[PDB]
């Protein structure tokens, strides 16, 4: 049975009144340093510090010169040389911006992506390796140290519609992508081809790898757009239009993730985390650092939390976090690194802080 309890301690609304599509706490800041999160929506990127007694301190905001820009995602990294935090942001314009959070200014930008960028992810071991997923059906791996495009994952057996989400596994050996074509695809980056491609991007016009063929592909999990995907050890968590996060794995129950052949036709559905009133597209789920908690907001402003340490996804359910003033769609949530704070961002530019009990 689940034991996690939260209390809503504060809320605010951003003056742009536009939907907030992304929220991320900085998991790189060291123990004892101030707890900082970024929000993204409209043409704005905003930074906040979490203080005692639910205080949410506005630090600074980045307002894009292009008023027509709509940011969809953000991801944190650090400069491997200076050690200072860096924040990557992107959306509708398809431009990746690397903001220095101290001054909240764009210090370098990447163009090229054929359209809108739906999600950004930093590699868990290498702070220079940034993954971007686009409306053009492709995934791109970048090296932000040498400003090189390491690889493009798409083409012949690539996605057939927008790539909506992607996630690196814990050790950063492989990516699982998902989109509007209903499929989930595996891309191994621990292959001899890719390891050498990455090594070459560090030696550095650079010649990018074009990965036309994934290492696994399935359309047997969801019957609509797959808007969110995350690894759960060797298993996968993914969701769609259908009011469930499905826990699955490529191949048969006993098959090894590293023993799966690219032509594998089987999938194993281990379980389902059920909820209600999240039948609208573009709603992310999140986990905490230790992967002990799973959270998802619905379209009527309710926040679901599950205990991942309880085996059956029925008894895993925590009490739903609700507040009568929070009625707008929760697009994304973020746990602070130590799982003590949960932030939820909404369609009406509202932000909600829940502290663990």
């Amino acid at each position: 049975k689940c034991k996690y309890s939260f209390k809503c301690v504060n809320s605010l609304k951003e003056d742009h009144n536009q939907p907030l599509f992304g929220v991320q706490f900085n998991w790189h800041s060291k123990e004892g340093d101030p707890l900082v999160f970024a929000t993204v929506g409209s043409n704005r990127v905003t930074l906040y510090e979490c203080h005692s007694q639910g205080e949410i301190r506005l630090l600074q905001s980045y307002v894009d010169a292009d008023a027509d820009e709509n940011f969809y995602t953000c991801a944190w990294t650090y400069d491997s040389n200076t050690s200072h935090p860096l924040l990557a942001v992107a959306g509708s314009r398809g431009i990746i911006r690397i903001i220095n959070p101290i001054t909240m200014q764009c210090i370098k930008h990447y163009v090229g992506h054929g359209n809108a960028i739906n999600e950004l992810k930093f590699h868990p071991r290498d702070p220079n390796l940034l993954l971007s997923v686009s409306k053009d059906h492709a995934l791109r791996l970048w090296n932000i140290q040498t400003d090189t495009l390491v690889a493009i994952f798409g083409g012949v057996e690539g996605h057939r519609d927008e790539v909506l989400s992607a996630d690196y596994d814990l050790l950063g050996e492989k990516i699982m992508s998902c989109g509007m074509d209903h499929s989930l695809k595996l891309w191994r980056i621990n292959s001899k081809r890719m390891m050498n491609a990455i090594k070459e991007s560090y030696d550095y016009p650079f010649i990018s790898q074009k990965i036309h063929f994934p290492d696994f592909s399935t359309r047997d999990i969801h019957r609509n757009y797959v808007d969110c995907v995350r690894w759960l050890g060797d298993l996968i968590l993914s969701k769609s239009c259908e009011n469930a996060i499905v826990c699955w794995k490529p191949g048969k129950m006993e098959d090894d993730i590293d023993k799966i052949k690219p032509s594998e036709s089987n999938v194993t559905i281990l379980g389902r985390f059920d909820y209600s009133q999240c039948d609208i597209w573009y709603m992310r789920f999140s986990m905490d650092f230790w992967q002990k908690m799973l959270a998802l907001g619905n379209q009527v402003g309710k926040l679901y939390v599950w205990d991942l340490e309880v085996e059956d996804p029925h008894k895993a359910k925590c009490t739903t976090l609700t507040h009568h003033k929070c009625g707008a769609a929760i697009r994304q949530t973020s746990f602070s690194r130590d799982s003590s704070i949960l932030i939820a961002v909404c369609d009406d530019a509202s932000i909600w802080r829940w502290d663990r009990l």
């Binding site: 998991w27 790189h28 060291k30 650090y78 050690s83 868990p124 071991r125 814990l170 050790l171 759960l232 050890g233 060797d234 298993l235 129950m253 281990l270 650092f289 230790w290 992967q291 340490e309 085996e311």
Partner: peptide, 27 residues
């Protein structure tokens, strides 16, 4: 057990990440 084994892989792999985070040089 599918659950117990998967939980141990998460435990060990997040531990490796946590160690790297602990060790990390600053300023």
């Amino acid at each position: 057990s599918m659950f117990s084994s998967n939980r141990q892989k998460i435990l060990e792999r997040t531990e490796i990440l946590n160690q790297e985070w602990k060790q990390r040089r600053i300023q």
